[PDB]
Write a protein that binds this ligand. Sequence first.
Ligand SMILES: Nc1[nH]c(=O)nc2c1ncn2[C@H]1C[C@H](O)[C@@H](COP(=O)(O)O)O1
Ligand SMILES: [Mn+2]
Ligand SMILES: [Mn+2]
Ligand SMILES: [Mn+2]
Length: 156
Amino acid sequence: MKASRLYTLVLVLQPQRVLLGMKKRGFGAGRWNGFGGKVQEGETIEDGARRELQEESGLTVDALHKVGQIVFEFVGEPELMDVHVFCTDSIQGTPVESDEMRPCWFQLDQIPFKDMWPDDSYWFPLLLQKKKFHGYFKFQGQDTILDYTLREVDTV
Ligand SMILES: Nc1[nH]c(=O)nc2c1ncn2[C@H]1C[C@H](O)[C@@H](COP(=O)(O)O)O1
Ligand SMILES: [Mn+2]
Ligand SMILES: [Mn+2]
Ligand SMILES: [Mn+2]
């Protein structure tokens, strides 16, 4: 049994495009990803997701909907990353570059999978189909999956 730390991941998914951020520094730098980060003490997971979306993309939203949960394990790290995944189609304002992220829209036939975390190739398609999911991925380093599980669920 391991301990796990809570993180959020937020996808702004519209009918024909999705907003991703190019991670400019830190964990997973150089990859397009959803917006998010560690949940802080006192806030709900959803509100932590809203906070990180605002900080990293400039977008304020009143609500997010939970679409999945993914646990990440890295060789040599005893702590698991428990990532709660949220979506919304409804945004106010324009995305703004932050120190952490450069936001960019992608058409839904141009999802940049080769420049995203490898796990996204497995669970992102479920997100696009408006399905809910639970996943687990064990990584050697940043590039290599050694074991994983992915399951569609009716309730996250
Ligand atoms: N394997 C992975 N696939 C993915 O799509 N996002 C990941 C990830 N591993 C971590 N993340 C996300 C979760 C958080 O939004 C963020 C890690 O927290 P910060 O580096 O503090 O933003 O990266
Ligand atoms: Mn952050
Ligand atoms: Mn943070
Ligand atoms: Mn972050």
